[PDB]
Design a protein around this nucleic acid. Structure first.
Length: 49
DNA sequence: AGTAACCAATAAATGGTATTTAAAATGCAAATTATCAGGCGTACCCTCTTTGCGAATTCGCGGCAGCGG
């Protein structure tokens, strides 16, 4: 709290990180590593636009 | 334009028994580079809300249930 910021501002980053890291590790039968998941997500975001 | 198979002889006829030759080639296990795979962190503020809508008008049957003398 010494930083003087609202709690939610800090907490949201950790929550997003945890959720996304898990959805990368689990959720596939054959486990693609994290970095490849990031690259595939970039690929898909570029393809739509 | 000349008979011999006489008895020695000559080594050539083989395909078989091996310790060699070292060169090669052929494999073998290191060093040594690339690249992949994990972990951490992010400071304006954000606070039950999304769902399934229906393994979808079945039907007939059974029976284990709650209310009731």
């Amino acid at each position: 709290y010494r930083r003087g910021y609202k709690f939610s501002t800090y907490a949201t980053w950790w929550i997003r990180q945890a959720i996304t890291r898990s959805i990368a590790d689990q959720a596939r039968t054959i486990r693609i590593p994290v970095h490849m998941i990031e690259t595939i997500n970039k690929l898909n975001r570029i393809s739509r636009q």
